[PDB]
Amino acid sequence: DKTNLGELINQGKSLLDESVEGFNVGEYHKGAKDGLTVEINKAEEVFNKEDATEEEINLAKESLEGAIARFNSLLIEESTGDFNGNGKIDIGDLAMVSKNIGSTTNTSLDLNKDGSIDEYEISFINHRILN
């Protein structure tokens, strides 16, 4: 039985259909759509016929559900990049990214969730402040 796996695949494709990457509120961080696509394809492979065992199907559902969660976590919100959490995005927030450039331990400052703080975060904060 692959009904639920197929349902999750269709949820993922719908997220792709409806989403755009960019720097603005309601958009997703660069790479979000590529990442979700890789995971949908993994799930699609298991979905496609043959002798997939119920455990293979279950692992695939689990991984794709995690991928959907990760995609949603990459949604840019009003407060994204307001780090000290003082209600606005300003030069203090840009300074926090700068001080922490190269950090692999600051997993609230890692906006695109790629594992480190670099020019992406700098570029994002500059864009939000000025626009």
């Binding site: 300003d90 840009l94 300074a95 926090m96 700068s98 001080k99 450039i101 020019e119 700098i122 570029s123």
Partner: protein
Amino acid sequence: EVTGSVSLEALEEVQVGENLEVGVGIDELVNAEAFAYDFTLNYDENAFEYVEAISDDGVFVNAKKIEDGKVRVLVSSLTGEPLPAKEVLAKVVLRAEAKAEGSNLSVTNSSVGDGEGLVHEIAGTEKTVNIIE
């Protein structure tokens, strides 16, 4: 108690059709370190047009025109170290369009952020420039 002041350098005289690079930095910052810097450059749009903002590779710069004669600039360190004082951090490139005497260049609305994300105001500065034919 944090105090500080902007630095501003440019040629004292340029001719119509020549670029004026206006170099902005931090003259002094007391009781804080700055990893990012937010300032506004004011100029006379009757004398100059705004072209772009540039920087050397230890610093990231983005700027946006607010209105004629007013450009907001953001500077941040790429080095893992604070922005240094007594160095040009960003240059705002203006282009001379018309003759002018004692045309004012001023930096206002200037503040810095520290490593912990705290913001501090710093004092602006001004100088004049002549545009000749």
